[PDB]
C-alpha cells in the first residue's frame, strides 16, 4: 500500500474505517454523517503520511494545516482535534525527533516509571514530551532490559532481542530512520545437520517439514472443528494435541496394513476353495478317463448300449475337462491378483527414527519462537496474534540492538542500580520505595501522582514477591499474572578469529539425538560482520542448560560444529558468553506466551490500571494511580520489542489524558 492509505497501514490502522479508540475521542463524527467521517479519515491518514515521510522532525499542528488542501483545511478545529489525538496516542511525534517548540518551561504532574526497558523508555519520552516530570527507576546498571547487547572489541552480539520482524507496519521502521540501525535482511535458507554431522538430503528435509506444517494444521483442526480443548478438566496444550495427532497417524498406518493383508487372505482363501474344487475334479477326471478307456478296450463289433457307454463317457469327460480349464482360467486371474497386492503394500511406518528426530528439530524451532515447551502452550490460543504479523523480510540489528534503548534514554532522568522494593498507591498519590543494588541498606523514597509499572511478567510472578504492592494488587490482576505463561530461551555467543562456515548461510540447524534434548543447541546464527556464531538453547533444554557451566556448554558447541565442518576446521573460541534469562532476577524468564488455561484477554487484564480506594470513607471515586506497560500487556503484539514500545506509547497517552486532560474530545 502507498499514499495516504499506506500511512494508515504503516500505523496499523484501517484506512477507510474509524477505530474504536477514534470512536471514543470523536463520538460526534462516527455517529454523524458518512461524508464527515471520510473527511476525518483523510485528515488522519494525511497527517500520518506527513509524519512518516519525515520522522526526524516534530510535526506540529501549524505544519499539518499548512500542507492540507480544501475542503479538508477548512475546519481548523477538526484538524486540531485529529492532530492532538495522534500526538497524544503516539502515532505521530514518537521516538527520537528534533523539537520545533522547545519543551514547556515548567512541568505538570509527577510520574515514576519502574524499569527502563523499551516499554519504560517509550513512555518516559512521551510523558516528558507532554510536559510531565518523569523519573525512571532501573535495577540494572544499564538501560534496555531484555534488549541486551554483548560488546567487546569488534565482537557485537545480542543476548536479548535481535530480530526486527518485518518493517511493514512496524513502529520500529520509524525508529530505524531516527536511529543509526544497521538493518540486514535474514536469508531464509536453513540447512539441517543430523547427530552424525551430515546434511539431511532435500528429499527428507521436505517430507518432514511438510509433515510438520501438516501436523500443525491438524491441531488447528482438532481445536476449531472438533472442539478438543478440555481433557480431564485440564485445558489441552499444543504438545498434547500434536501427540494425539501423531498417534492417529500411526493408527491409520496400521489400519491400512491390516485391511491390505485382509485383502490378501480373502483372495488367498478364494484360491484355497478353487484349488480344492480343482483337486476333486482332477480326481473325477482321472477315474472317468479310466472308465472310458475300459469301455474302449471292448473291441467292435458291439451292441448299442456298449457303443453308448463309449460315447457317453466321452461326452462326460470333455464336459469335465471344460470345467477344469475354466477353473484354471480363474486360477490365473486370482494368482496374479495376489502378485498385484503383494507388489504394492501400504506405508510401512508413519515416521522412522531418523524422521522423528528431524521432526523434533521443527518442534524445537517452534519451542524457540514461543520460548517454551509445546506442552505449556494453549491449543486454542497459542497463535492468537497471527493476524497482526508485519509484512516484509525479518532483519537483524548488525550494530547491536542496544543502540535503540540507549538512543531513547538520552535526555531522561534515569536512576540506575535502583531496585524497587515496594509500591504504595493511595487516593492522594503514590510512593515508591527502592534500594541501591550495590549496598542494599541504602533506601530511597519517591513521591508521585502516578506509577507506571513495566516490571517483566517473570518478576511480577515471583513467589515470594520481589516487589510488594500496598495495598495488594486485586485478585483479577494476580490471577492473570499466574495464568499467563512466561517462557525462556537462551543464547551462546561464540567469537572466532576466522570464518569456517558457509558465509552466505545465515542460519543452520543441528538435529538432536532425543526428543528430550531437541532444544539443546539446535540452531546457529551467522549474522554479524565479525566472525561470530550464535547458538540457541530452546524448549525444555533452556531451563536445564542454565545449571551447566559455560565451558561444558561451549564444549558441546564445538563438538557439534566439528561434526559439521571438520574436526580441525573449528578452532578454539576467543570470546564466549552464555545467557541465563530465567536465572536473571530482573527478568525471571525471556518473554510471555499464551499458556494453556490462559487467553489473549489476560493481556488486556494485565494492561488495566489500578484505582485505589478512597482515603476518607464516602469521598468521591479516586483517580487511577497504578498503570502497567510492557511486552506482557499488549494483546496484539506480545513478546516483542515493537509490542513493548507500543505499550509504553499507550500508557503515556492514557496517563497524560488522566493528569493533563483531553482537550481534543470536545
Ligand X SMILES: Cc1cc2c(cc1C)N(C[C@H](O)[C@H](O)[C@H](O)COP(=O)(O)OP(=O)(O)OC[C@H]1O[C@@H](n3cnc4c(N)ncnc43)[C@H](O)[C@@H]1O)[C@@H]1NC(=O)NC(=O)[C@@]1([C@@H](CC(=N)Cc1ccccc1)c1ccccc1)N2
Instruction: For ligand X, give the closer residue by CB, 425 or 664.
Output: 425
Exposure string of 5-39, with b = 16+ CB inside 10 Å and e = fewer, is ebbbbbbbbebeebeeebeebbeebbeeeeeebeb
| Footprint (CB under 8 A) of other proteins, residues 184-243 | 214-215, 217-218, 221-222, 225-226, 228, 231, 243
The binder of 413, among ligand X, other proteins, none, by C-beta within 5 to 8 A per type, is none
Instruction: For other proteins, give the closer residue by CB, 317 or 662.
Output: 317
The binder of 308, among other proteins, ligand X, none, by C-beta within 5 to 8 A per type, is other proteins
Beta bridge partners of residue 232, listed in sequence order? none
Distance of closest approach, residue 346 Cβ to other proteins, in angstroms: 12
Instruction: For ligand X, give the closer residue by CB, 50 or 639.
Output: 639
Write the secondary structure of 578-636 as one string of H (helix), E (strand) and C (coil). Answer: ECCCCCCCCCCCCCEECEECECCHHHHHHHCCECCCCCCCCCCCCCCCEEECCHHHCCC
Chain CA centroid to CA 222, Å: 19
Q: Which residues have C-beta within 8 Å of that of residue 448, sequence separation ≥ 6?
A: 110, 111, 112, 135, 429, 430, 431, 432
CB 651 within 8 A of CB 663: no
Distance of closest approach, residue 417 Cβ to other proteins, in angstroms: 51
**Distance of alpha carbon 285 from alpha carbon 659, whole angstroms:** 113
The binder of 501, among ligand X, other proteins, none, by C-beta within 5 to 8 A per type, is none
Contact between 116 and ligand X per CB under 6 A: yes
Among 122, 135, 125, 139, smallest CA distance to 459 is for: 139
Contact between 114 and ligand X per CB under 6 A: yes
Contact between 568 and other proteins per CB under 8 A: no
Q: Which residues have C-beta within 8 Å of that of residue 92, sequence separation ≥ 6?
A: 47, 48, 51, 59, 83, 86
**Distance of alpha carbon 87 from alpha carbon 50, whole angstroms:** 13
Q: Which of 29, 79, 137, 495 touches ligand X by CB under 6 A?
A: 137
Contact between 280 and other proteins per CB under 8 A: no
| Distances, alpha carbon 540 to alpha carbons 80, 485, 490, 517, 577, in Å | 54, 14, 11, 8, 20
| Distances, alpha carbon 584 to alpha carbons 139, 456, 526, in Å | 12, 11, 26
Instruction: For ligand X, give the closer residue by CB, 43 or 122.
Output: 122
Binding residue count for ligand X, defined by CB under 6 A:
44
Q: Which of 324, 500, 501, 565 touches other proteins by CB under 8 A?
A: 324
418 a known binding residue? no
CB 534 within 8 A of CB 157: yes
Instruction: For ligand X, give the closer residue by CB, 39 or 543.
Output: 543
Contact between 456 and ligand X per CB under 6 A: yes
The binder of 314, among other proteins, ligand X, none, by C-beta within 5 to 8 A per type, is other proteins
Q: Which stretch, 84-92, 326-334, 587-595, 597-605, contacts ligand X (CB under 6 A)?
A: 587-595
Distance of closest approach, residue 231 Cβ to other proteins, in angstroms: 6
Per the rule left: phi > 0, alpha: psi between -120 and 50, beta: everything else, 657 is alpha
Distance of closest approach, residue 373 Cβ to other proteins, in angstroms: 19
Instruction: For other proteins, give the closer residue by CB, 16 or 287.
Output: 287
Known binding-site residues for FAD equal 119, 138, 140, 146, 162-163, 631, 640-641
Q: Applying CB under 6 A, which residues contact ligand X?
A: 114-120, 137-140, 145-147, 160-163, 165, 369-370, 385, 419-420, 454-456, 459, 466-467, 489, 491, 581, 586-587, 590-591, 630-631, 639-642, 644
Amino acid at each position: 500500500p502507498s499514499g495516504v492509505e499506506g500511512a494508515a497501514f504503516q500505523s496499523r490502522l484501517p484506512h477507510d474505517r474509524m477505530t474504536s479508540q477514534e470512536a471514543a475521542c470523536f463520538p460526534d463524527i462516527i455517529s454523524g454523517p458518512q461524508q464527515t467521517q471520510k473527511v476525518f479519515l483523510f485528515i488522519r491518514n494525511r497527517t500520518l503520511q506527513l509524519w512518516l515521510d519525515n520522522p526526524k522532525i516534530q510535526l506540529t499542528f501549524e505544519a499539518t494545516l499548512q500542507q492540507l488542501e480544501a475542503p479538508y483545511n477548512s475546519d481548523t478545529v477538526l484538524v486540531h482535534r485529529v492532530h492532538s489525538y495522534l500526538e497524544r496516542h503516539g502515532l505521530i511525534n514518537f521516538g527520537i525527533y528534533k523539537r520545533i517548540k522547545p519543551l514547556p518551561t515548567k512541568k505538570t504532574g509527577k510520574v515514576i516509571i519502574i524499569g527502563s526497558g523499551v516499554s519504560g523508555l517509550a513512555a518516559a519520552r512521551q510523558l516528558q514530551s507532554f510536559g510531565m516530570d518523569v523519573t525512571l527507576l532501573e535495577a540494572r546498571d544499564r538501560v534496555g532490559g531484555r534488549v541486551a547487547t554483548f560488546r567487546k572489541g569488534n565482537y557485537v552480539a545480542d543476548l536479548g532481542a535481535m530480530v526486527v520482524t518485518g518493517l511493514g507496519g512496524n513502529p520500529m521502521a520509524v525508529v530505524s530512520k531516527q536511529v543509526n540501525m544497521e538493518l540486514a535482511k535474514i536469508k531464509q535458507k536453513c540447512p539441517l545437520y543430523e547427530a552424525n554431522g551430515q546434511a539431511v538430503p532435500k528429499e527428507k528435509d521436505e517430507m518432514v517439514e511438510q509433515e510438520f506444517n501438516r501436523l500443525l494444521e491438524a491441531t488447528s483442526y482438532l481445536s476449531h472443528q472438533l472442539d478438543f480443548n478440555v481433557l480431564n478438566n485440564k485445558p489441552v496444550s499444543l504438545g498434547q494435541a500434536l501427540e494425539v495427532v501423531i498417534q492417529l497417524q500411526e493408527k491409520h498406518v496400521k489400519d491400512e496394513q491390516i485391511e491390505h493383508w485382509k485383502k490378501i487372505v480373502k483372495t488367498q482363501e478364494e484360491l484355497k476353495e478353487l484349488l480344492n474344487k480343482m483337486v476333486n475334479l482332477k480326481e473325477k477326471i482321472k477315474e472317468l478317463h479310466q472308465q472310458y478307456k475300459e469301455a474302449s478296450e471292448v473291441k467292435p463289433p458291439r451292441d448299442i448300449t456298449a457303443e453308448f457307454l463309449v460315447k457317453s463317457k466321452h461326452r462326460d469327460l470333455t464336459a469335465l475337462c471344460k470345467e477344469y480349464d475354466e477353473l484354471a482360467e480363474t486360477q490365473g486371474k486370482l494368482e496374479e491378483k495376489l502378485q498385484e497386492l503383494e507388489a504394492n503394500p501400504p506405508s510401512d511406518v508413519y515416521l522412522s527414527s531418523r524422521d522423528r528426530q528431524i521432526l523434533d528439530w521443527h518442534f524445537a524451532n517452534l519451542e524457540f519462537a514461543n520460548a517454551t515447551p509445546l506442552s505449556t502452550l494453549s491449543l486454542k490460543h497459542w497463535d492468537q496474534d497471527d493476524d497482526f504479523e508485519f509484512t516484509g523480510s525479518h532483519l537483524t540489528v548488525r550494530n547491536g540492538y542496544s543502540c535503540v534503548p540507549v538512543a531513547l534514554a538520552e535526555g531522561l532522568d534515569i536512576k540506575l542500580n535502583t531496585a524497587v522494593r515496594q509500591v504504595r498507591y493511595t487516593a492522594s498519590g503514590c510512593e515508591v520505595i527502592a534500594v541501591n543494588t550495590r549496598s542494599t541498606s541504602q533506601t530511597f523514597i519517591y513521591k508521585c501522582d502516578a506509577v507506571l509499572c513495566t516490571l517483566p511478567l517473570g518478576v511480577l510472578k515471583q513467589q515470594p514477591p520481589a516487589v510488594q504492592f500496598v495495598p495488594p494488587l486485586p485478585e483479577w490482576k494476580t490471577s492473570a499474572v499466574q495464568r499467563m505463561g512466561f517462557g525462556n530461551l537462551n543464547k551462546v555467543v561464540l567469537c572466532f578469529d576466522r570464518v569456517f562456515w558457509d558465509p552466505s548461510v545465515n542460519l543452520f540447524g543441528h538435529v538432536g539425538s532425543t526428543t528430550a534434548s531437541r532444544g539443546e543447541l539446535f540452531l546457529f546464527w551467522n549474522l554479524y560482520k565479525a566472525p561470530i556464531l550464535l547458538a540457541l538453547v530452546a524448549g525444555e533444554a533452556a531451563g536445564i542448560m542454565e545449571n551447566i557451566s559455560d565451558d561444558v556448554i561451549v564444549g558441546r558447541c564445538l563438538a557439534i560444529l566439528k561434526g559439521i565442518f571438520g574436526s580441525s576446521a573449528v578452532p578454539q573460541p576467543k570470546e564466549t558468553v552464555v545467557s541465563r534469562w530465567r536465572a536473571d532476577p530482573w527478568a525471571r524468564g525471556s518473554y510471555s506466551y499464551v499458556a494453556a488455561g490462559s487467553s489473549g484477554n489476560d493481556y488486556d487484564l494485565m494492561a488495566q490500571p489500578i484505582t485505589p480506594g478512597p482515603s476518607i470513607p464516602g469521598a468521591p471515586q479516586p483517580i487511577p494511580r497504578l498503570f502497567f506497560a510492557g511486552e506482557h500487556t499488549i494483546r496484539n503484539y506480545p513478546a516483542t520489542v515493537h509490542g513493548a514500545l507500543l505499550s509504553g506509547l499507550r500508557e503515556a497517552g492514557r496517563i497524560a489524558d488522566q493528569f493533563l486532560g483531553a482537550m481534543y474530545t470536545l
